[PDB]
Amino acid sequence: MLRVYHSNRLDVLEALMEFIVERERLDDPFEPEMILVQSTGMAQWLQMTLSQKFGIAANIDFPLPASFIWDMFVRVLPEIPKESAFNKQSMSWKLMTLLPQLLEREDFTLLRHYLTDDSDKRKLFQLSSKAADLFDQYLVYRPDWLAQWETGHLVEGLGEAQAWQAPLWKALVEYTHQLGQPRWHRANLYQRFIETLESATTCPPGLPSRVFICGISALPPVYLQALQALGKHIEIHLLFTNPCRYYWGDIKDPAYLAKLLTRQRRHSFEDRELPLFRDSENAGQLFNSDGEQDVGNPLLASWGKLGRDYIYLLSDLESSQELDAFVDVTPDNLLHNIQSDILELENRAVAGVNIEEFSRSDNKRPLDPLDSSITFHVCHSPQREVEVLHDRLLAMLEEDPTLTPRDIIVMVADIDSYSPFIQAVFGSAPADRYLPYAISDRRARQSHPVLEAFISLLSLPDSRFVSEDVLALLDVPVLAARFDITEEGLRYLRQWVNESGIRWGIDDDN
Amino acid sequence: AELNAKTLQRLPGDNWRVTSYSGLQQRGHGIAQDLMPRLDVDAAGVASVV
Amino acid sequence: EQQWQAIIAEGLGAQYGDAVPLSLLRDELAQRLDQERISQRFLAGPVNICTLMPMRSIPFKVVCLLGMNDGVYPRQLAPLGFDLMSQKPKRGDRSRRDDDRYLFLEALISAQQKLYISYIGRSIQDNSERFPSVLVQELIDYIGQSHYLPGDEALNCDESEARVKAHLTCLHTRMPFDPQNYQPGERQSYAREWLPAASQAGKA
Amino acid sequence: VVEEFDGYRQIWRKRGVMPMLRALMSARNIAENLLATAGGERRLTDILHISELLQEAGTQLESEHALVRWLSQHILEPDSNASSQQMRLESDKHLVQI
Amino acid sequence: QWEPVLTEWITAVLQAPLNETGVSLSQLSARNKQVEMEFYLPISEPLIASQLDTLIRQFDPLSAGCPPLEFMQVRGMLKGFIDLVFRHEGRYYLLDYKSNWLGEDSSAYTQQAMAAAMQAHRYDLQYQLYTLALHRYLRHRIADYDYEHHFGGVIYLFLRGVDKEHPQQGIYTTRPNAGLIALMDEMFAG
Amino acid sequence: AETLDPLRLPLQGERLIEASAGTGKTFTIAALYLRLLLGLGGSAAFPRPLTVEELLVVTFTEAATAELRGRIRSNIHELRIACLRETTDNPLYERLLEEIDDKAQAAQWLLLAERQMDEAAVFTIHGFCQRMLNLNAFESGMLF
Ligand SMILES: [Mg+2]
């Protein structure tokens, strides 16, 4: 069965997962646990929490949702290759060959004028990559489009670009057939897998006992359909972090609103039912004629676009069971006040449309001056911003003894832009006034000099061979160590190259 | 007016850390473990294989 | 070597037999090196300093946000222009704008004890005014409208909102050696390195 | 003094460019004597801006000598249209503005 | 040109006898093998090199031969990767691969030389921590687990040392004492 | 030449505006932006109300760009608050409310416009050229 757990905080879902793992365990020790996460840090945090509670965390796999779905496809349906022939990487190299042949056709005339300029095949490769990305996105989200394009028909009421995209894909479906690669892909596999699972009398062998999905707040609808089909045979546990207690998604039709009102969420351990809406009788008043609900809190209304579609798709599941793990947030601080406003789906902001409401301010909640839960800081430069953040973190650490450096997190829009200032400010700090830090999500290319140097070596054929460039190549320590050149010798080499007359060029042939 | 900077009565501790056997034993590796999580760090210091 | 092998393996998987120049593989390698990122020390134990990653929401006691100026966040990505999905939106579609707009709410609700927000209000060169992101603006507007400072009951809603928004915004000095930093208050610095310069005690 | 400059070079190799300049200014009281001297505030602001620029540049360079070469190249031929190279405001105080 | 040799080099590894039992890699089925298992081990109390070395030296003669350990006090998680975990006749084992270039000749890959090689690189603490991890994992996963019944020992395989003619070369087998594992577990716990 | 009136300016075809020193051209730009958002002016008004993304503004420098963007956001917020309260002290907002037929629909439109302020199409010449080349790589022939 497919079970959906709702909780405002991730810690309660993690504790429920720990409880589920403690109650029932896999029969075979080699059988690895399955957890579905999209980010690596989430898997690291889950492993750390599980190892801290149970005392160890091993034999746990964290595959991506698409990889897990393809693995289930390979396991259930017969005669399926391990790796799909249709993927972002291979479709690029296939279209790179397919496009010049299709250039002659009228339908691709707009592409033809684009491919006339390039002479080193850069435009062809870039177009192939940009088309393979959109083909992958269509495989994921638009299977009916590709199913109609394969036959040769066009989708009614679509964009004009389809005119050049529909034949090409079809040619691809033919071209991969000529090479002998497997015909199967995700769009064809979806319906056959769903039918095979629906018509199965017993669970097919090789399936995992239980599957955990956690940390994922957005899933494609077809993946949700496949998970609903798979839940009947193997147990699936979805841990969804829901910021609002009540149902804040939109509705499709009033008939959908009725069966939505019928649905209720049971308590985790108290065995008490709870309605989805705060007021069942006045639930229809909230929704608009088009079907878009008006969210009570303005912040959740503005920033809740992503979770709204996900909760609406989760509510559509017929055979899914739902539970509530929500924890109340006492409004003892400003941040707690905002979180409680988000949780209880209420708007405390006063509009002031009335004269009495505009005249007085007693309607608002009283704020404490010493309270510093939410603070805003204005700086002049990123250097000053980090220099102020360091002192603020030191003050926060001095204020609270239980606070530790690991508990603090600092997020920046562009990590690469602020990494130099972060390093400089945190390193310039003395011994006593020191704070250990660690930087993540930085680009790998800028990590080591060797990576940058090699990239330059790849550009040897199209080079003018300036003397300063060749000397900067020697400035690298590993390269100088390879040719047994020291720094004292590097000085003599610099002087001799300066006074000898070497300006540019390696030989007359260059 | 007189100007005096604040002092830190408590010093933050770097005792808590997540480590591996290679980082605990082999100091020379440096950040080699960060670049490749599954790099064979047991063997280092290549020799002449001309 | 691994990236090079992966590129050439993905090329050979499609059985491409035509000649390939060096510049193509070079550019492919240079792009893939930029795409890859390192996150092995996310929870090592020191303070975590990284970018906002979608779908990653972990509870932390102190959550700080830097670089929230207008035009920097939310990060913007434009469609190709020939993407049929972008022309007709549908439920379940994912855009980077909505991803960042929901990451901001995730970071708001993830803060257990303290939330910190910083942005560049004034330009260091021309001393000209700069504005924050729209999300931080909506947040501070909601905070000002929702709450009132003690002793402001007599005043109207707009004056109380303005007074509350002024109470939470802290404008720091332009230079680290400014004496205003080394005074008893909320923004007293822990760096005694600039204390001698501030005391203006020196020989010409 | 040679040992002191060797320690400065070690700090440069380990922590970075600006962490070395910070220690160099703190050990010899450069900022204090500059602010004490008439007109030294402009010089101190320029030094700090150049330190920030040197950090930003050395972040994206292969070797340490490459940073010295980059600084010398920027010094030999300067760009006035670049917004980053524009000189910052000398002081935030209320003074006669030219 | 490395094709004809390496293939043979693979076969001698698959058809080699790991221990007294005579179990071989080729015999093992796909369901009985686990490759590259990752484990996290929590350390509740600070770990001191001196006390750990004092505890380890008495139980293990290899550690008694080695010089004392030196490392900073650590408190947190321990990350580890295991090359191969396989069960034979109801008893679980541990297998690690070592691609280190010990010597240029076969005599450098003998058992006596492999002992000194293990001593030099301090792989003893490595396999001891791996045994602690595997013991905790088998205790957690298996409802009825006994260390004496379900543990088979540690196997280190030097790929270059492996030779078809000489069975002893290229393999190092050693099972830690149960009391040492229990004391290490108690030390890591509290 | 004719004395300019922001409320009565016909937003059709090509119009040239001369703003002398001290006249405050930014105020007129903001008033015209609000008119284009709300479609006010009758015959002088645009045939259909335009969204924030559709409106295009070109500025000389980055600082002027940020200043105009922030001022447009502030004016949108103030006009929305005035439409909600239906009573404003500013004369320009008062004339706008006079021209507005329905204040609730205008307030909803202004709320949507304020929520779409980060996607405002206010750029410089170089940024506009770069974005137009990127969005139309096929027609222009530029690399991706
Ligand atoms: Mg190994």
UniProtKB/TrEMBL annotation, chain F:
ATP binds at A19, S20, A21, G22, T23, G24, K25, T26. It comes from the Bacteria. Heterotrimer of RecB, RecC and RecD. All subunits contribute to DNA-binding. Interacts with RecA. The N-terminal DNA-binding domain is a ssDNA-dependent ATPase and has ATP-dependent 3'-5' helicase function. This domain interacts with RecC. In the RecBCD complex, RecB has a slow 3'-5' helicase, an exonuclease activity and loads RecA onto ssDNA, RecD has a fast 5'-3' helicase activity, while RecC stimulates the ATPase and processivity of the RecB helicase and contributes to recognition of the Chi site. Belongs to the helicase family. UvrD subfamily. A helicase/nuclease that prepares dsDNA breaks (DSB) for recombinational DNA repair. Binds to DSBs and unwinds DNA via a highly rapid and processive ATP-dependent bidirectional helicase activity. Unwinds dsDNA until it encounters a Chi (crossover hotspot instigator) sequence from the 3' direction. Cuts ssDNA a few nucleotides 3' to the Chi site. The properties and activities of the enzyme are changed at Chi. The Chi-altered holoenzyme produces a long 3'-ssDNA overhang and facilitates RecA-binding to the ssDNA for homologous DNA recombination and repair. This is RecBCD enzyme subunit RecB. It comes from Escherichia coli. The gene is recB. The chain holds residues 5 to 148 of 1180 of the full protein.
